[PDB]
């Protein structure tokens, strides 16, 4: 990638330092902390200036790669991340692992209208550690789950539609915290936006064939 091409959300929030809202536990990556969510309201937001870097990256690429490892409580609907209005309450974007529907839901709010699509057949809420690679480009969403499963969906509007200039002045990025009653239940690890790479590159380097 180029400069500012990897954004580790938990690192950005300083959640490993803090103590409230989560427990540090082990995950698939032995070199980094995993986060069992306790009260996602208390996990700090990504700082404004870091979020604006992330926004500029998404705008430039017209897309992103979002990687996440998760161990999600079965039959729960859990927000992986969301862009919450600083206040005129509501969200402008979320990624939700929907264990009720067996989907990964992508929601975007543009000009005060909500546009939501389900990636179907994306049953992430099992007993177990799962690793995802979500590639969003223009109005397309492509989800790889572990190594050998791919599911796709199209958005009503392009992703850069949401990621406008000083989105940072209107919203902040929260991890594991969503709308109403949709906070993540379970463990998360290595929730990272990555730019200037392809899914193929990610998968090859994670040992998939």
CA distance 150 to 202: 14
Residue 49's contacts (CB-CB under 8 Å, 6 or more residues apart) are 168
Q: Which of 112, 198, 103, 117 is nearest to 161 (CA)?
A: 112
First to last CA, the chain: 22
Cα separations in angstroms, 178 against 48, 90, 144, 172, 184: 18, 10, 23, 12, 8
CB contact at 8 A, 149 and 45: no
- Could you say which DSSP state residue 29 is in? -
Say if CB 187 and CB 34 are below 8 A apart: yes
Place of tokens 């954004």: 7
Method: X-ray
Structure tokens at 176: 């594991």
> Which burial class, exposed, middle or buried, applies to 209 when counting CB atoms under 10 A from its CB (0-12, 13-18, 19+)?
exposed
Cα(126)–Cα(7) distance, rounded to whole angstroms? 27
Alpha carbons 205 and 202: distance in angstroms, whole number = 5
- CA–CA dist 137, 48 (Å, integer): 24
- CB atoms under 10 Å from CB of 170, counted, come to 14
CB 117 within 8 A of CB 98: no
User: What DSSP line would sit under 69-116, residue for residue?
Assistant: EEEE-TT-EEEEEEEEESSSSSEEEEEEEETTTTEEEEEEEETTEEEE
Half-sphere exposure of 68 (CA within 13 A, CB side): 26
Resolution in Å equals: 1.9
Task: Tell me phi and psi for residue 126, to 5 degrees.
Answer: -115, -170
* Full residue range of the structural domain in which residue 44 is found: 1-209
CATH code: domain of residue 120 = 2.60.120.200
Measured in degrees and rounded to the nearest 5, phi and psi for residue 123 equal -80, 90
Q: Which helix (H) or strand (E) holds 19?
A: none
Upper half-sphere CA count for residue 92 (Cβ side, 13 Å):
23
CA distance 132 to 189: 11
Instruction: Compute how many other C-beta atoms are within 10 angstroms of the C-beta atom of residue 105.
Output: 21
Into how many domains does the chain fold?
1
Angstrom distance (rounded) from CA 77 to CA 98: 4
- The separation between CA 190 and the C-alpha centre of its own chain, rounded to angstroms, equals 10
Q: How far apart are CA 92 and CA 113, in angstroms?
A: 9
Tell me which residue of 58, 167, 153 sits closest to 109, measured CA to CA. 167
What is the H or E stretch that residue 166 is in?
A: none
Residues 97, 140: Cα–Cα separation, whole Å: 18
> In the block, which residue shows the tokens 């480009």?
137
């Amino acid at each position: 990638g180029g400069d500012n091409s990897v954004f580790d959300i938990f690192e950005l929030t300083g959640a490993a330092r803090k103590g409230s809202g989560r427990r540090l536990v082990k995950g698939p990556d032995p070199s980094s902390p995993a986060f069992r969510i306790e009260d996602a309201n208390l996990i700090p937001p990504v700082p404004d200036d870091k979020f604006q870097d992330l926004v500029d990256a998404v705008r430039t690429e017209k897309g992103f790669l979002l990687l996440a490892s998760l161990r999600q409580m079965k039959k729960t609907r859990g927000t992986l991340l969301a862009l919450e209005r600083k206040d005129h309450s509501g969200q402008v974007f979320s990624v939700v692992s929907n264990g009720k529907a067996g989907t990964l839901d992508l929601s975007l709010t543009v000009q005060g209208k909500q546009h939501v699509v389900s990636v179907e057949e994306a049953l992430l809420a099992t007993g177990q550690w799962k690793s995802i690679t979500l590639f969003v480009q223009e109005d397309r969403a492509q989800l790889y789950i572990d190594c050998e499963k791919m599911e796709n969906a199209e958005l009503d509007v392009p992703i850069q539609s949401v990621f406008t200039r000083d989105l940072a002045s209107i919203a902040r990025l929260r991890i594991a915290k969503g709308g109403v009653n949709d906070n993540f239940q379970g463990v998360l690890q290595n929730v990272r936006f990555v730019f200037g790479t392809t899914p193929e590159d990610i998968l090859r380097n994670k040992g998939c064939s």
